[PDB]
Amino acid sequence: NKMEAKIDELINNDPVWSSQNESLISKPYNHILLKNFRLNLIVQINRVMNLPKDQLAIVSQIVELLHNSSLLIDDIEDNAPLRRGQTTSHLIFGVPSTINTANYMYFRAMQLVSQLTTKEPLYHNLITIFNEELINLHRGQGLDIYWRDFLPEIIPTQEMYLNMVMNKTGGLFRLTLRLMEALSPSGHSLVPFINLLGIIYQIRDDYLNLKDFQFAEDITEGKLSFPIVHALNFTKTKGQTEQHNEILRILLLRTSDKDIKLKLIQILEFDTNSLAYTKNFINQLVNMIKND
Amino acid sequence: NKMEAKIDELINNDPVWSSQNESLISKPYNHILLFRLNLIVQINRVMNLPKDQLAIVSQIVELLHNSSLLIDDIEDNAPLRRGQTTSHLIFGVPSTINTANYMYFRAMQLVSQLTTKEPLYHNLITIFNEELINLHRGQGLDIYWRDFLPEIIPTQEMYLNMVMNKTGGLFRLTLRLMEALSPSHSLVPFINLLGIIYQIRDDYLNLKDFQFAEDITEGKLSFPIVHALNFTKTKGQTEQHNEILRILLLRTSDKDIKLKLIQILEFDTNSLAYTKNFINQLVNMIKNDNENKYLP
Ligand SMILES: CC(C)=CCC/C(C)=C/CC(C/C=C(\C)CCC=C(C)C)(P(=O)(O)O)P(=O)(O)O
Ligand SMILES: CC(C)=CCC/C(C)=C/CC(C/C=C(\C)CCC=C(C)C)(P(=O)(O)O)P(=O)(O)O
Ligand SMILES: [Mg+2]
Ligand SMILES: [Mg+2]
Ligand SMILES: [Mg+2]
Ligand SMILES: [Mg+2]
């Protein structure tokens, strides 16, 4: 009877969640917070969208949660040891807590959308954009991960890699902009532009990762970067069998040996000219804007 | 010129995605597909959702359920899920995490297809939202206790609230959606008690079937363990309290060491007996529910 009442009380109330609990399970996330330029893009874009700063704040909050959560997970998936010159959360708090916290923040983010409007028609568009771009994000990420973890099952071509980027990187970039375009109280859609900004961003990330070495973690990962994809297809094309295989073998070692990583890079520098190709590819993309 | 052409085309289109791609990413989910729908069908008798809108609800629930099992096995370092090899051991942790999270959002998208009524949608999303949030909190606490042991040893109360969040999330989600779509007293209190019977029973059966008892290997703060731990602390049984902690902290597969911890629960604290009793009472709260305060 006393137990029965304590239970009766329980099952008839909402589940209990204290602020301490909230603090406890937010450790992996608070860690990565300690790591502005994401708001510079939002403030600029806004110069054109004209959103009241009240709503722009809630937009900035949604994107950061989604962004920081993405990084918490991408690090697990990529077995990354450092993020922004700091130990990654999964190495401190563990993979289990990090996955849960990150996925949890995805839903806190989703919850904040209610705060952008009272308008039922608008709200629905918002949730849809939120849904679509998150679905796109996971698709690209699924390919980048599949290609990597199952190499050499599939050697992506420049086209396949770019579709993957349109999904993955474009995902976050389109989410931010598409949401603002729906809240804008006010020319043409800036989506095409943000997609190009996303592609340039990703290929420059892939590129600087190797040039900054020449610590090239992307090689330790086995990632099918823009430079590696060109090297692999170039090599198959010109009949360079041993080079094509050494590239695959090195990617598959998941090595942190600096000399082995340097060898690979010099292969992309003198043998396949992938570094130059990529540099040019980036410049051309930028020129497409600068010459618009 | 020609490169400019292709890029232009690319950025002016939706991201490309074929079904072959869809198949790649689904592999980890398909692997886990290889009684619940009966419970949903049964519940509809009072809800009366049109066999079709009910299929969708059913699909949403299945995506979520199956997806959380894939993530939970990664978090629990489980080598087996119903006799077969767990997905992350076959497809790796990265793809499995991603495929499971992708499915969460596919589930979130099916919600838009239950209704086209603007208020009713906002209420379905809210429900979906709230329950997924409660589910992650319960899981977060469950993992936290397990991974920070012995910083915090939960009490029966703490444990049960963790269950209301975790196990209650997936049970309530299903029920609150159905009740909201119903064309026809809430059964949420009843689903809550159910979830609790189910979880305490899950923890109970895990040890009893052995008497592989993976929960021990996992180091989990299961219901019998929570009892044992607070039972020895109360009776001041120092060694035994520490011995229980020591075994959980071993993350062992040692059949012999697992046996010992169980020996402790059976002989020293009688936690297993205490739990069998607990379950029964909860059920009687339902069995002896005359006037149907909980039952329909
Ligand atoms: C977890 C899921 C589905 C997706 C996660 C996708 C992400 C963020 C991956 C992280 C990497 C690329 C960085 C990006 C895209 C930052 C974008 C910045 C904005 C300001 C939008 P990195 O590790 O940081 O180099 P990647 O090299 O692994 O491609
Ligand atoms: C991934 C996130 C946030 C939450 C996941 C929560 C889950 C599913 C945990 C799995 C376990 C409990 C079993 C359940 C819930 C049976 C399926 C439920 C139905 C309602 C049919 P188990 O491993 O199967 O014993 P647990 O013992 O680890 O608590
Ligand atoms: Mg990465
Ligand atoms: Mg990556
Ligand atoms: Mg589990
Ligand atoms: Mg678990």
UniProtKB/Swiss-Prot annotation, chain A:
<dbReference type="GO" id="GO:0046872">
    <property type="term" value="F:metal ion binding"/>
</dbReference>
<dbReference type="GO" id="GO:0016114">
    <property type="term" value="P:terpenoid biosynthetic process"/>
</dbReference>
<feature type="binding site">
    <location>
        <position position="78"/>
    </location>
    <ligand>
        <name>Mg(2+) 2</name>
    </ligand>
</feature>
<dbReference type="GO" id="GO:0033386">
    <property type="term" value="P:geranylgeranyl diphosphate biosynthetic process"/>
</dbReference>
<comment type="pathway">
    <text>Isoprenoid biosynthesis; farnesyl diphosphate biosynthesis; farnesyl diphosphate from geranyl diphosphate and isopentenyl diphosphate: step 1/1.</text>
</comment>
<dbReference type="GO" id="GO:0004161">
    <property type="term" value="F:dimethylallyltranstransferase activity"/>
</dbReference>
<dbReference type="GO" id="GO:0008299">
    <property type="term" value="P:isoprenoid biosynthetic process"/>
</dbReference>
<dbReference type="GO" id="GO:0033384">
    <property type="term" value="P:geranyl diphosphate biosynthetic process"/>
</dbReference>
<feature type="site" description="Important for determining product chain length">
    <location>
        <position position="106"/>
    </location>
</feature>
<dbReference type="GO" id="GO:0004337">
    <property type="term" value="F:(2E,6E)-farnesyl diphosphate synthase activity"/>
</dbReference>
<comment type="pathway">
    <text>Isoprenoid biosynthesis; geranyl diphosphate biosynthesis; geranyl diphosphate from dimethylallyl diphosphate and isopentenyl diphosphate: step 1/1.</text>
</comment>
<protein>
    <recommendedName>
        <fullName>Geranylgeranyl pyrophosphate synthase BTS1</fullName>
        <ecNumber>2.5.1.-</ecNumber>
        <ecNumber>2.5.1.1</ecNumber>
        <ecNumber>2.5.1.29</ecNumber>
        <ecNumber>2.5.1.10</ecNumber>
    </recommendedName>
</protein>
<feature type="binding site">
    <location>
        <position position="168"/>
    </location>
    <ligand>
        <name>dimethylallyl diphosphate</name>
    </ligand>
</feature>
<keyword id="KW-0653">Protein transport</keyword>
<feature type="binding site">
    <location>
        <position position="67"/>
    </location>
    <ligand>
        <name>isopentenyl diphosphate</name>
    </ligand>
</feature>
<keyword id="KW-0460">Magnesium</keyword>
<feature type="binding site">
    <location>
        <position position="74"/>
    </location>
    <ligand>
        <name>Mg(2+) 2</name>
    </ligand>
</feature>
<dbReference type="InterPro" id="IPR008949">
    <property type="entry name" value="Isoprenoid_synthase_dom_sf"/>
</dbReference>
<dbReference type="InterPro" id="IPR033749">
    <property type="entry name" value="Polyprenyl_synt_CS"/>
</dbReference>
<feature type="binding site">
    <location>
        <position position="202"/>
    </location>
    <ligand>
        <name>dimethylallyl diphosphate</name>
    </ligand>
</feature>
<comment type="function">
    <text>Catalyzes the trans-addition of the 3 molecules of IPP onto DMAPP to form geranylgeranyl pyrophosphate. Required for the membrane attachment of YPT1 and SEC4. May be involved in vesicle trafficking and protein sorting.</text>
</comment>
<dbReference type="InterPro" id="IPR000092">
    <property type="entry name" value="Polyprenyl_synt"/>
</dbReference>
<dbReference type="Pfam" id="PF00348">
    <property type="entry name" value="polyprenyl_synt"/>
</dbReference>
<feature type="binding site">
    <location>
        <position position="84"/>
    </location>
    <ligand>
        <name>isopentenyl diphosphate</name>
    </ligand>
</feature>
<feature type="binding site">
    <location>
        <position position="169"/>
    </location>
    <ligand>
        <name>dimethylallyl diphosphate</name>
    </ligand>
</feature>
<comment type="similarity">
    <text>Belongs to the FPP/GGPP synthase family.</text>
</comment>
<dbReference type="GO" id="GO:0004311">
    <property type="term" value="F:geranylgeranyl diphosphate synthase activity"/>
</dbReference>
<dbReference type="GO" id="GO:0045337">
    <property type="term" value="P:farnesyl diphosphate biosynthetic process"/>
</dbReference>
<feature type="binding site">
    <location>
        <position position="223"/>
    </location>
    <ligand>
        <name>dimethylallyl diphosphate</name>
    </ligand>
</feature>
<dbReference type="GO" id="GO:0015031">
    <property type="term" value="P:protein transport"/>
</dbReference>
<feature type="binding site">
    <location>
        <position position="78"/>
    </location>
    <ligand>
        <name>Mg(2+) 1</name>
    </ligand>
</feature>
<feature type="binding site">
    <location>
        <position position="38"/>
    </location>
    <ligand>
        <name>isopentenyl diphosphate</name>
    </ligand>
</feature>
<feature type="binding site">
    <location>
        <position position="209"/>
    </location>
    <ligand>
        <name>dimethylallyl diphosphate</name>
    </ligand>
</feature>
<keyword id="KW-0963">Cytoplasm</keyword>
<keyword id="KW-0125">Carotenoid biosynthesis</keyword>
<keyword id="KW-0808">Transferase</keyword>
<feature type="binding site">
    <location>
        <position position="74"/>
    </location>
    <ligand>
        <name>Mg(2+) 1</name>
    </ligand>
</feature>
<keyword id="KW-0813">Transport</keyword>
<keyword id="KW-0479">Metal-binding</keyword>
<feature type="binding site">
    <location>
        <position position="83"/>
    </location>
    <ligand>
        <name>dimethylallyl diphosphate</name>
    </ligand>
</feature>
<keyword id="KW-0414">Isoprene biosynthesis</keyword>
<dbReference type="GO" id="GO:0005739">
    <property type="term" value="C:mitochondrion"/>
</dbReference>
